[PDB]
Design a protein around this ligand. Sequence first.
Ligand SMILES: COc1ccc2c(n1)CCN(C(=O)CCCC(=O)O)[C@H]2C(=O)Nc1cc(F)c2c(c1)CCC2(C)C
Length: 217
Amino acid sequence: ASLTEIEHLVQSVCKSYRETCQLRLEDLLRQRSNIFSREEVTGYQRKSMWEMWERCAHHLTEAIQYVVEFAKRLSGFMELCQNDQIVLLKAGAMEVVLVRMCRAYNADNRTVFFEGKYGGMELFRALGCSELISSIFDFSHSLSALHFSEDEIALYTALVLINAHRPGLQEKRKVEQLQYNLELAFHHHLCKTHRQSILAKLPPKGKLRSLCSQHVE
Ligand SMILES: COc1ccc2c(n1)CCN(C(=O)CCCC(=O)O)[C@H]2C(=O)Nc1cc(F)c2c(c1)CCC2(C)C
């Protein structure tokens, strides 16, 4: 794999991300000042857990679909066998959503984008799982401190998906090749942008999978 192929891969992954990100960074930052009022927060708190689940499950399910589309546009992903495509998405898609979420999170006031405005974690009180929700907020908070660029997110989330250690894979070696090239791309790009320093601050790969255990519970 030459320098030309590696930079092509970087640009390609970043393009796919751009086309499948759902919420434009520009929009999210501008909307940071648009914050749910205390009356609105109360309105969300009064809703049933069933309604809040319906709303959240709809928005996240949609977010999952954008991640599937991202995967489809990654060089080599569609060339993998049926079984491996599904195994990877099943294991990684929700982890990618979680990472993508840090973009929609404002660390100055500890709020997240939801249904047109920014609200804190108390917005989700009717769900009755303050632990899971605080941990999601903590995770987005610790990722926000890194100032993840759009392209770092693209490359990093490509690696969250293209993991050759997912159990159930048939063509393990073809997934390794793809992972290897994406790692070269990620590392090359951190080099060129002087952002090597973030490597040692990214959350461990089993730490993403430990928040999705209790998600599925
Ligand atoms: C992957 O990154 C993100 C981040 C936020 C949103 C999305 N993606 C999907 C679009 N969206 C909307 O609210 C779109 C509604 C458009 C409409 O009005 O119909 C957002 C949302 O879903 N935010 C959001 C959704 C959540 F389910 C949660 C949080 C937050 C925290 C806690 C919890 C995990 C419960």
